[PDB]
Homo-oligomer: A and B are copies of this chain.
């Protein structure tokens, strides 16, 4: 009884628009009057660094949330920002048209339409359409494209051959571009229409996870970006000056930059390769050592500190996180304990997220502490990232992951979680299919159910398969969102998102306690197993699914200004 938003298919932008018969340039580009196809966009047809926008009322509620999520990716990785339209002469009007499409560049026409239609509410689709708005074309149309890919003309659907035309017009050809067609673009049959000449990229082309490194380089070079709104720092200890961090102790303890520890880890997490290590084996009980960042300058007032930790020491050792915030009244700073990380499981790298709310210049202080008893190792930290973003609400850590890919036993249910509004939920990850991974959001019976609004109204669940790249700026995480529509009905006439005790099926927790699970809402095409096995989604055989469930009923109201 699960609901698949993708209807048992894996349709890209180009499959959605083809199925509607839109006949746009290269499937999703709306050419302007006398605009030259695949031509250089001049300075006059560019947006300012901050783009005014309107999210029109025709947009689906899930689409509005997804678009705002896309803006947060631009704010982390570029110096492009977006602001609600306040009367500027030109702005982007995002609306529910037929299919997903955009003009290429700032056409200087005042209100400029960008369509995010039905089935276009995917963050990378939004990112792709806004790259068109910013002035970018597709990658496979480059004049040198035949040196990198082969077009299988006999496999293209009759009358769709013109979508592969090249014109007359530097960064290397980018197979990973979010602006590249997939190998199945306009195919007639089961055989690919685009074959990469380098066999390694056959299943890479057509990625729809995030911007590629080359997509970002081109955009950041165009807008002269030297910073972003929400990136703060990334440290993997790869250089001897360790990103300006300063280690100290009053206890004959220290943090050492090492490539290995005899008791563990045998190597860094980044994966020659270095990490910081607090030895607890040869210091006295209660000895501490602090590793302090250089001074950082926040622009937003909320932050997410994240890092990987390895414990080869004792159950009694701990890592304390402090913030030292500086203000005019106290130049030595105000030191505050923000997190105590205790009883760290031994023998594996583990990801931690710490929520911060610092508004003044500050330093992050990592304090390793030796606890009671004996130790043969210590605490190791690597891949520290800091951004002015919200921490995920919940994190589902799946260990020994690879054994489940394409396997009949690959039907995984997350631990139960409580959303911000108090709804209890569970995630279902289906890895049993031969080619695609599926992901579904379920409401479950919870302690607050008697006082909650039913059917569940406009909660947006964002599920992110983390790309565990050492640098937050280089992660191409695979993210999908769904929104609970309180008017959605089942085949039997009941409300899909009603109270699980009323419409749910019986299930058991790992401990054997019975509960009610509502219908699952999600997609059978979350990611292909081939892409799931690429980049750093799996690292040390661990997978992380980040989860945020929030009320988006405030997005219903007309955008006024």
Contacts and interface: CB of A to CB of B under 8 A. Distances in A.
A198 B245 CA distance: 10
A200 B200 CA distance: 42
Interface in A213-263: 221, 224, 226, 240-244, 246-247
A173 B144 CA distance: 43
- Interface centre among A197, A198, A272, A295, by most chain B C-beta atoms within 10 angstroms, is A198
A150 B431 CA distance: 56
Contact of A170 (B173, B198, B224, B295): B295
B221 A172 contact: no
A266 interface: no
State the number of copies, please: 2
Contacts of A241: 172-175, 198, 201
A198 B255 CA distance: 12
Interface residues of A, number: 27
Given A147-B246, A197-B247, 7 more contacts: A148-B244, A148-B246, A170-B297, A172-B241, A173-B294, A198-B242, A224-B224
- Interface centre among A172, A174, A201, A246, by most chain B C-beta atoms within 10 angstroms, is A172
A170 B224 CA distance: 17
Q: Which 8 A-B pairs have the closest CB atoms?
A: A172-B244, A224-B224, A221-B226, A200-B240, A147-B246, A172-B243, A173-B244, A172-B294
Nearest to A297: B170
A296 interface: yes
Contacts of A242: 198
A197 B252 CA distance: 10
Interface of A: 144, 147-148, 170, 172-175, 197-198, 200-201, 221, 224, 226, 240-244, 246-247, 272, 294-297
A170 to B, nearest CB: 6
A240 B201 contact: yes
Contacts of A175: 241
Given A144-B294, A170-B297, A294-B172, A198 B272 contact: no
B201 A170 contact: no
Nearest to A218: B226
Contacts of A172: 241, 243-244, 294
Nearest to A328: B168
A78 to B, nearest CB: 14
Contacts of A221: 226
A257 to B, nearest CB: 9
A539 to B, nearest CB: 16
A243 to B, nearest CB: 5
Contacts of A174: 241
Contacts of A240: 198, 200-201
